[PDB]
């Protein structure tokens, strides 16, 4: 194959240069499990037992015993497949555009296949990370003109049946009001018996800067960040708490546990960018190529994610 | 007035964000391109880049050329120019096109998605009769006199 | 069956694709091994 | 089209209301780690206490007699069981299988303890209950002796489950 | 119960009537050994004659524009194709993936030959046809040039398929 398909050989050499996604930091190693498909749906069944009555004493002779029931729930996860096309130079045509310092046509914005693929892969990965955190696909900084997606395709920010808190516009700078809502949201969380788990916090940089201020007269030797860490530790049974900063978020705080039993990420094994065998070729030096990637595979339990939105109006 | 800016830049580019990084005049071709599209090239008179073109005939010694124009003489839409050879890449009016095109600097604020567009005498799109063009976005200003817009052209109308 | 192995030689596009997914998985495993919070 | 989809969802919900274990696809996992009050559901088949020497009979049924008192109805096909009470009561349906349309029923000669459908929420503990014409338990001329162990618990708009022990017929 | 099941059947039939390939399980196989007149079906996607160099565009759709003329409607989400005609005609829908809810459209700049939905059974061969507001073809303000090749064929109460060739716009 590598003796026949130059483009396949080029991708194999250049695949190591693509950087790992930042979404890996948002999840524990145990929370991510690969599945095997490209487009469609999968079903997961969770079995739970229950006690139907008080236990019975084993005294003398008896044959009437209490019963233990069972029940199951099924959750359907929708996946999707998307593709992008990019132009580049034909392999035989590179030698006629090689220069002493670079290869390519500067005037017409044409690259060798290896360079174009690496840049195109990086752009796709950024869009992948945006969807995982936000649940939406868009290329506008305004966030409008979103691509309509399938049902049962949610991200962390748009997962339904989760706790959402809104900070009023007038209190957007009042850190005390912000912490008031967070505590209320932390109260409404329902972790069941899995509360003894590490937690993860994601904040936009603007909120991150507000946190590093000294904790409020005023005090010292303590920051708003540490106050948040203690408050979260009150509900996770004094477990570890991690904080991360993502430029993708805007005036929003995300809190969710790091227990696979509550939130699990099950993406396709072909989610990351993958080259396509179809390569358009003409009489000129311009060729076209396609890259494929798969979206979907986030599963979470009801009322286990806290979403604080700071209204900047 | 050029595919690539004539003046150099004193600054490197920041390749961090991925949103709204395509509203540049150097963006050639169409946003969505079909592999079964018919692509022509012609000698270029003037700079018809990102504009509707019409056939231009000289005395007869030289072959015909394409110049920015519209109205009853619209032949296609120019989507690329090679400056070294002066060859203008033209997509015929009989072929569907979707991309960023020059917009008239008059009432550009009034252009909204879903508005009917027609080419003027200078190959610039304007809000409306004979050409089926619909704006898909709002006017993006790249220069004090240069406005581009996402529009789809799908042939002539009755 | 990963692109990291130089001895590996795919025979067709399908094996090439499977090697890519294996290569991505190994990198994800390697990242979590070297991740410290 | 969308209106047809909405009407289809409405009728599907109405049909699934009268079902033992309706199959639904949900986007999230419901969490019920608390082990208390996890047994009062419409899919809890059988009884709270079950003996190895209990007599179980499977019969074809008409309607939905699940968790209701049943009576034999003779019509050509074999006789079936229909939800009903009064003096015609033959047994109580404790399980159902919709694929084969077969109801598993305990005869009236065998005592039972479990959750059954009640007419309304006016039933308290230590109350004498009678099966009505629809096979639902209503507060009290009782041919059988059924006493409520708990109070009526509501799950759906009309679903009322009450824990009752039935131990034969009166005189 | 029984009334609910009947309403479920009626709603399911009405919904699946407006479907390209509704999934109906049958108790027995059908006989179609004759090789003639097997192409007049609602699930016969694509066109009678298709060129390798045809242009296909996939867009999200609202409603059910299958085998109908489509227009572009811009709303926040991306623009979507909706069943409509008149002077707003952008193309014709030739296929729909219901899982992704994505419709495939051939632009009006391309010529097509295939079966399309007609307004009623009043269409004869060699007739000029116009797309109505609903994206259905009606007998003749013909901004486009479409000619019927066969007569209107009936599959259902409102399903009328007619073989038409559309080759651009008039002047």
TrEMBL record, chain A:
Q: What is this protein called?
A: Uncharacterized protein
Species for this entry: Borreliella burgdorferi (strain ATCC 35210 / DSM 4680 / CIP 102532 / B31)
Q: Which UniProt keywords apply?
A: Plasmid
From TrEMBL, chain B:
- Keywords for the protein's UniProt record, in alphabetical order: Plasmid
Tell me which InterPro entries the record gives: DUF228 (IPR004239)
One Pfam match = DUF228
According to UniProt, the name of this protein is: Uncharacterized protein
In its UniProt entry, the species of origin is given as Borreliella burgdorferi (strain ATCC 35210 / DSM 4680 / CIP 102532 / B31)
From TrEMBL, chain C:
Protein name stated in the entry:
Uncharacterized protein
Taxonomically, the superkingdom here is Bacteria
Q: Which organism is it from?
A: Borreliella burgdorferi (strain ATCC 35210 / DSM 4680 / CIP 102532 / B31) (Borrelia burgdorferi)
TrEMBL record, chains D, E:
Alphabetized Pfam families for the sequence: DUF228 (PF02989)
Which InterPro entries does its entry note? DUF228
What top-level branch of life does the organism fall under? Answer: Bacteria
The alphabetical list of record keywords is: Plasmid
Listed name of the protein:
DUF228 domain-containing protein
What is the organism field in this record? Borreliella burgdorferi (strain ZS7) (Borrelia burgdorferi)
């Amino acid at each position: 194959l590598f003796d026949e398909n130059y483009y396949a050989k080029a991708v194999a050499n250049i695949i190591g240069e693509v950087k790992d996604p930042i979404m890996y930091k948002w999840f524990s190693p145990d929370q991510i499990e690969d599945v095997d498909l490209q487009m469609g749906y999968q079903k997961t069944v969770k079995w739970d037992a229950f006690l139907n009555a008080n236990p019975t004493t084993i005294a003398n002779e008896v044959n009437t015993i209490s019963t233990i029931g069972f029940s199951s729930e099924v959750v359907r996860l929708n996946y999707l497949k998307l593709q992008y096309k990019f132009r580049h130079l034909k392999q035989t045509s590179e030698k006629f555009y090689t220069s002493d310092s670079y290869i390519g046509d500067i005037n017409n914005n044409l690259l060798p296949f290896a360079q174009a693929y690496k840049l195109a892969s990086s752009e796709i990965i950024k869009l992948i990370n945006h969807f995982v955190l936000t649940g939406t696909v868009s290329i506008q900084k305004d966030g409008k003109n979103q691509k309509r997606l399938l049902p049962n395709m949610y991200g962390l920010l748009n997962m339904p049946e989760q706790i959402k808190e809104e900070v009023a516009s007038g209190d957007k700078d009042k850190m005390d009001k912000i912490f008031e809502k967070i505590e209320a949201g932390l109260s409404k969380l329902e972790l069941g018996d899995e509360f003894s788990t590490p937690m993860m916090v994601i904040v936009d940089p603007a909120t991150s800067l507000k946190l590093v201020k000294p904790y409020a007269a005023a005090s010292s030797c303590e920051k708003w960040e540490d106050v948040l860490i203690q408050t979260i530790k009150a509900i996770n049974n004094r477990e570890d708490v991690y904080i991360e900063t993502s430029n993708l978020l805007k005036h929003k705080i995300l809190i969710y546990p790091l227990n696979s039993e509550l939130i699990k990420f099950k993406p396709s094994k072909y989610m990351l960018p993958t080259p396509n065998e179809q390569v358009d070729k003409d009489s000129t030096d311009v060729a076209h190529s396609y890259i494929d990637f798969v979206l979907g595979g986030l599963l979470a339990t009801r009322k286990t994610i806290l979403q604080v939105n700071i209204k900047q109006s | 007035l050029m595919k690539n800016p004539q003046q150099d830049s004193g600054l490197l580019s920041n390749s961090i964000d991925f949103r709204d990084q395509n509203l540049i005049f150097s963006n050639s071709g169409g946003v969505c391109t079909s592999s079964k599209d018919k692509i022509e090239n012609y000698p270029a008179k003037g700079y018809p880049y990102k504009r509707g073109v019409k056939l231009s005939f000289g005395d007869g010694t030289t072959e015909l050329e394409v110049e920015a124009g519209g109205g009853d003489d619209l032949y296609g839409v120019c989507s690329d120019i090679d400056e070294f050879s002066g060859m203008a890449t033209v997509i015929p009016i009989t072929n569907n096109f979707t991309g960023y095109l020059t917009l008239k600097k008059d009432g550009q604020n009034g252009v909204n998605p879903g508005d009917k567009l027609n080419f003027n005498q200078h190959g610039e799109l304007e809000k409306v009769k004979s050409v089926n063009a619909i704006a898909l976005s709002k006017a993006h200003k790249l220069t004090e006199d240069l406005f581009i817009v996402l529009a789809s052209v799908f042939g002539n109308r009755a | 069956a990963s692109l990291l192995d130089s001895n590996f030689v795919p025979i067709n596009f399908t094996e090439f694709v499977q090697a890519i997914s294996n290569t991505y998985k190994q990198r994800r495993i390697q990242f979590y091994e070297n991740l410290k919070r | 089209t969308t209106q047809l989809v909405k009407e289809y969802q409405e009728k599907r919900s109405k049909l699934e209301k009268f079902m033992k274990n309706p199959q639904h696809d949900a986007s999230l996992l419901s969490n019920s780690n608390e082990f208390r009050d996890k047994n009062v559901e419409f899919f809890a088949s059988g009884g709270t206490r079950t003996s190895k020497f209990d007599k179980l009979e499977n019969h074809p049924f008409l309607g939905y007699p699940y968790k209701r008192g049943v009576k034999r109805v003779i019509q050509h096909y074999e006789p079936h069981v229909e939800a009903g009470g009064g003096e015609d009561l033959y047994g109580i349906c404790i399980d159902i299988d919709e694929f084969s349309k077969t109801a598993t029923i305990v005869p009236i000669t065998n005592n039972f303890e479990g959750y059954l459908v009640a007419k309304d929420s006016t039933v308290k503990v230590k109350d004498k209950l009678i099966f009505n014409k629809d096979g639902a338990l209503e507060k009290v001329k009782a041919t059988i002796n059924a006493t409520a162990l708990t109070d009526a618990k509501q799950i759906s708009n009309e679903v009322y489950l009450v824990k009752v022990a039935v131990f034969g017929n009166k005189a």
